Amino acid sequence: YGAAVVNIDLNRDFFDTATGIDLTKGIPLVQDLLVPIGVTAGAEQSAEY
Amino acid sequence: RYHESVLEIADIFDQADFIQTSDAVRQLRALMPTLSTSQIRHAIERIAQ
Amino acid sequence: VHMTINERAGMSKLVADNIIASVIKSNWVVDILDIEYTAEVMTPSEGYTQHVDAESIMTAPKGKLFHLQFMDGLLRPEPSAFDPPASGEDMRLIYPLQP
Amino acid sequence: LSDDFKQISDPKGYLTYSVKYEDQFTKKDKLRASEADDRIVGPTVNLFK
Amino acid sequence: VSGLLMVLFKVMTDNRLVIVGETTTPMSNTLSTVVNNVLRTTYHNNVGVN
């Protein structure tokens, strides 16, 4: 009782940090996969999704 | 006056043996940035790592 | 004016501040399609932990993921009958275009 | 058999733009957009500021 | 006249041979569409003015 909202997220425990995946924001994210060449990819890039 | 849409190969061919995927891969590729060949190599090396 | 902004890229700070001013004063509605974002859905007790000034929304680089927060106010218990009236008005600028 | 060529990476032109600014109307402070587009558009934007 | 000659000589003997330099390949989504229409995948880090 008093639960504001129930969500259905991807299992963070299964898609672990071992897979390079973050799930804190609702979407999957993986750094340094799809990236610019010759420059550092910007932080919080949408391509990560 | 048309209507562009993806059309799965399964809807054309009757032989299931040579049909591994669906519309969903094309939709996922539509999510991707166009990749230069070195970016593709980078992605492959990343997944490998 | 229902102004649609497909891309903020070259837009000057003057023009951006001015468009926001038009949103506030001329009551413009300015959809901005450039933005990609995630949306944590806050519940009223947890408040708005993060914040986004209009300046940052008009000047954030394309391809960065914005992380907007949206309250679900449905679990907000009715005000005490004897709480003082609000002379002012709570306002809002940012809305989603999609569910 | 010959030292025919001097190899170089980022070639300089015979011509180049020059620009005199009106100091009264110029903001000496640098202009910049997103890092991505300032990487390209940048120097041009600052020259023809 | 001497200056035009030395320019002419310096051009007549410009035995430079371009090798590819440092070059970015920006992820496309980060570029405002006007720049994306111009850029063709990669470009030298030392983009000049234009």
Backbone angles phi, psi at E17, to 5 degrees: -135, 105
Note the Cα B29 to chain centre separation in Å: 5
Q: Is the dihedral of CA D30, D32, D36, D39 positive or negative?
A: negative
Tally of CB atoms within 10 A around A46 = 21
Say if residues C61 and D36 touch (Cβ distance below 8 Å): yes
Tally of CB atoms within 10 A around B8 = 13
Cα D35 to Cα C64: distance, rounded to the nearest angstrom: 11
Q: E33 by DSSP, 3-state: which?
A: helix
Going by the DSSP 8-state scheme, the letter that residue C88 receives in this structure is: S
Say if residues C9 and E33 touch (Cβ distance below 8 Å): yes
Cα E31 to Cα E42: distance, rounded to the nearest angstrom: 13
Distance from CA of A44 to the nearest CA of C (A): 6
Q: Which residues of C touch A4 (CB under 8 A)?
A: 43, 72, 74-75
Method used experimentally = cryo-EM
> Given the DSSP bridges, would you call strands C65-69 and C36-40 parallel, antiparallel or unpaired?
parallel
- Across the interface, do C9 and D33 touch by the CB < 8 Å criterion? yes
Residue E25, beta-bridge partner list: A37
A41 — contact with chain E (CB < 8 Å)?
Answer: yes
Who contacts C89 (Cβ-Cβ below 8 Å, separation ≥6)?
A: none
Cα B3 to Cα A41: distance, rounded to the nearest angstrom: 37
Polymer length in residues for chain E: 50
Q: Which amino acid is at A5?
A: V
Chains that touch C (3 or more CB pairs under 8 A): A, D, E
- Across the interface, do A42 and D39 touch by the CB < 8 Å criterion? no
For testing the chain B interface, which of E33, E37, E41 should be mutated: the one with the most B CBs within 10 Å? E41
Q: Is the dihedral of CA D8, D9, D14, D16 positive or negative?
A: negative
Q: Which amino acid is at D42?
A: G
| 3 state SS for chain B | CCCCCCCCHHHCCCCHHHCCCCHHHHHHHHHCCCCCHHHHHHHHHHHHC
Residue C8, exposed/middle/buried by CB under 10 A (0-12, 13-18, 19+)?
A: buried
Note the Cα E42 to chain centre separation in Å: 12
Who contacts E27 (Cβ-Cβ below 8 Å, separation ≥6)?
A: A34, A35, A36, A41, A45, A47, B33, B39, C63
For testing the chain A interface, which of C33, C46, C65 should be mutated: the one with the most A CBs within 10 Å? C65
Helix (H) or strand (E) holding A4: none
Cα C19 to Cα C28: distance, rounded to the nearest angstrom: 8
Chains that touch B (3 or more CB pairs under 8 A): A, E
For testing the chain E interface, which of D17, D19, D32, D41 should be mutated: the one with the most E CBs within 10 Å? D41
Cα E21 to Cα E38: distance, rounded to the nearest angstrom: 20
Outline where C49-93 has alpha helix (H).
Answer: 54-59
Which residues 20-59 of C are in CB contact (within 8 Å) with D?
Answer: none
Cα A21 to Cα A48: distance, rounded to the nearest angstrom: 9
Note the Cα E32 to chain centre separation in Å: 21
Say if residues D21 and D46 touch (Cβ distance below 8 Å): no
Cα C27 to Cα C20: distance, rounded to the nearest angstrom: 9
* Token output for C24: 């506030």
Cα D7 to Cα A45: distance, rounded to the nearest angstrom: 37
Cα D17 to Cα D22: distance, rounded to the nearest angstrom: 16
Closest residue in E to D7 (Cα) is: E17
Q: Is the dihedral of CA E32, E34, E36, E42 positive or negative?
A: negative
Backbone angles phi, psi at C44, to 5 degrees: -55, -35
Q: A30 by DSSP, 3-state: which?
A: strand
Chains C and E touch (3+ CB pairs under 8 A): yes
Cα A49 to Cα E29: distance, rounded to the nearest angstrom: 13
Q: Which amino acid is at B40?
A: I
Chains A and B touch (3+ CB pairs under 8 A): yes
- Across the interface, do E45 and A38 touch by the CB < 8 Å criterion? yes
Say if residues C93 and C68 touch (Cβ distance below 8 Å): no
* Token output for D4: 């025919």
Q: E44 by DSSP, 3-state: which?
A: strand
The candidate with the shortest Cα–Cα distance to C41, out of A1, A8, A30, is: A8
Outline where C12-90 has alpha helix (H).
Answer: 13-25, 54-59
Residue E43, beta-bridge partner list: E24
Cα A32 to Cα C38: distance, rounded to the nearest angstrom: 19
Say if residues A41 and A35 touch (Cβ distance below 8 Å): yes
Residue C5, beta-bridge partner list: C32
Residue A30, beta-bridge partner list: A21
